[PDB]
Amino acid sequence: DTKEQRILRYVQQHAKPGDPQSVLEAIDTYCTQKEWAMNVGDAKGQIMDEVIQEHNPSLVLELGAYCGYSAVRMARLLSPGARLLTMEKNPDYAAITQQMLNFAGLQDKVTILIGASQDLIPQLKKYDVDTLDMVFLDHWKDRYLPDTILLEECGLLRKGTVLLADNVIVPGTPDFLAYVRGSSSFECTHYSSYLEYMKVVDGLEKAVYKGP
Numbered sequence: 289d290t291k292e293q294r295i296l297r298y299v300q301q302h303a304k305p306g307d308p309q310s311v312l313e314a315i316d317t318y319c320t321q322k323e324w325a326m327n328v329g330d331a332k333g334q335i336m337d338e339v340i341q342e343h344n345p346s347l348v349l350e351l352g353a354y355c356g357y358s359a360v361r362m363a364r365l366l367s368p369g370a371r372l373l374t375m376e377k378n379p380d381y382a383a384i385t386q387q388m389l390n391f392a393g394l395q396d397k398v399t400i401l402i403g404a405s406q407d408l409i410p411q412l413k414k415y416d417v418d419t420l421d422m423v424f425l426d427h428w429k430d431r432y433l434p435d436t437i438l439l440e441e442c443g444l445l446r447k448g449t450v451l452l453a454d455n456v457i458v459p460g461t462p463d464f465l466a467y468v469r470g471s472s473s474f475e476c477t478h479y480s481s482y483l484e485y486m487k488v489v490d491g492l493e494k495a496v497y498k499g500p
């Protein structure tokens with residue numbers, strides 16, 4: 289019984305089906321009071337909400353779905369006929385996200401593509417995609433910079449395409465910021481957001497020397 293399964297149960301048991309806001313408050317409630325989980329949260333969500341409303345996207349790409357919180361967060365604001373694509377490399381997470389979208393009533397607005405961003409991004413042409421209006425980067429931080437260039441070289445970015453990258457300060461995406469902040473092709477803006485708690489997997493490598 290994974291933690292992602294438990295979050296889904298709590299939603300299925302507490303949220304008003306077909307009410308995305310109710311879904312979000314159920315996830316925020318459970319992930320603030322029972323088990324912390326790596327969803328953007330409501331505070332960041334309110335930034336995301338304003339970016340979507342102020343930039344009025346029609347085609348959105350998400351890198352990193354996890355349980356679907358940020359997909360529900362964005363999908364619920366999109367206009368009729370607007371699409372959200374979300375790329376997720378973990379199949380267990382993708383399934384959880386799919387149920388989350390179904391319960392929220394947003395499955396018609398979203399298309400989950402299972403796989404790694406670096407392998408799927410070059411495929412988007414074969415998904416009836418020309419260019420993107422908005423891109424939310426919240427997957428592996430090691431991938432913000434190469435995916436951005438990949439999106440450029442693939443001809444997926446248009447003049448005015450919005451990029452929104454999470455966790456640029458904590459734990460940090462300093463090469464990505466240095467690239468877009470320093471490039472003439474990107475006009476950047478930073479949105480501070482307080483964070484009460486965040487846990488990320490790290491590790492230590494022991495290496496015993498055995499001789500030349």
Ligand SMILES: Nc1ncnc2c1ncn2[C@@H]1O[C@H](CSCC[C@H](N)C(=O)O)[C@@H](O)[C@H]1O
Pocket residue numbers: 326327328329351352353354355356357358359375376377378381403404405406426427428431
């Ligand atoms: N290269 C890659 N391609 C697609 N997904 C990736 C990826 N590297 C990491 N991920 C996924 O990105 C997720 C980051 S957590 C994302 C949280 C979610 N976007 C939200 O805020 O609601 C993880 O579930 C991980 O499986």
Ligand SMILES: [Ca+2]
Pocket residue numbers: 326327328426454455
């Ligand atoms: Ca995040």
